[PDB]
Design a protein around this ligand. Sequence first.
Ligand SMILES: O=C(O)c1ccc(C(F)(F)F)cc1
Length: 338
Amino acid sequence: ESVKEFLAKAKEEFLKKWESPSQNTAQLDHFDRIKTLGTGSFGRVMLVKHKETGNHYAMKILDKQKVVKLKQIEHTLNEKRILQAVNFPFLVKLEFSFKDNSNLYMVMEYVPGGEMFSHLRRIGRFSEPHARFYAAQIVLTFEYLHSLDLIYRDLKPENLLIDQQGYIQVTDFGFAKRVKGRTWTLCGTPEYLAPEIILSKGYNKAVDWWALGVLIYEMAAGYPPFFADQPIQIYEKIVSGKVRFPSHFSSDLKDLLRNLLQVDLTKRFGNLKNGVNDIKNHKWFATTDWIAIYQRKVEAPFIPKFKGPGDTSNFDDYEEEEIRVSINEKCGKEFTEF
Ligand SMILES: O=C(O)c1ccc(C(F)(F)F)cc1
């Protein structure tokens, strides 16, 4: 009942913000630009500093015209409407949002420890306890998101940032969506796609549990289970229902992964009658104190090395490009609700 009542309150609080979203809570000239932390085909993330408070933030900047051309309008509206409404210990917080003639802006907390991906590739693979610590945080995060009827749809090591306490904070809600029932969009990264996405089915929150299987495998092995050189080869392996496990995997880990990486979505852990509890009660998680993880009372496997809230050393280097704001409003109609 304690969990039920927690989730009931979580949904109440989400819905109030979902139904009345915040808008236009800062502007660009309140910030100084420091460094580009990441780039893509329609946006980028920049470390910025608020000129009055001195706080650092990660500012996600989306080019409206490019969002339209790449057919990401609904996805970007989803991302902002969801982020301004959620609240959970393992989600990067949205602090401000606004738009101008050219761009959409989401000003996020800055997590200086960098992406799990970097740390995983540095060390090779995580031990099972280390992978389990991160996996538990994803399980709780998905329990939270799914209870709000949200599907995340972009789990991968690059989207898991490591904070100053060594805990995960999930970033990038660009594919997140509120879904009662099924949804159909092809999105995600190839190695993490569930079979039902590849096969163009109407799919549901079970795709997130599949992706958790992929993530746990990759953390514990150092490479993902369906690895191949070309996407088509990855997709063939994903749909085949065959996975090979390293001999160093424990039997408990292999058993959990067979049930998360279940091609038949109606048999996949997280999507059965007992929901998330089939995962939380699995023997691989027997040492996990779920409440202590939620309360951040467990000592983390490692604390990322960084010098302060302005340190960018754990992120990589990109060409520094202008943030140009047109003299004329672009795509105003499409982004009215942002
Ligand atoms: O919130 C942050 O601290 C942050 C978010 C996103 C990114 C990245 F560029 F990789 F997408 C970096 C940092």
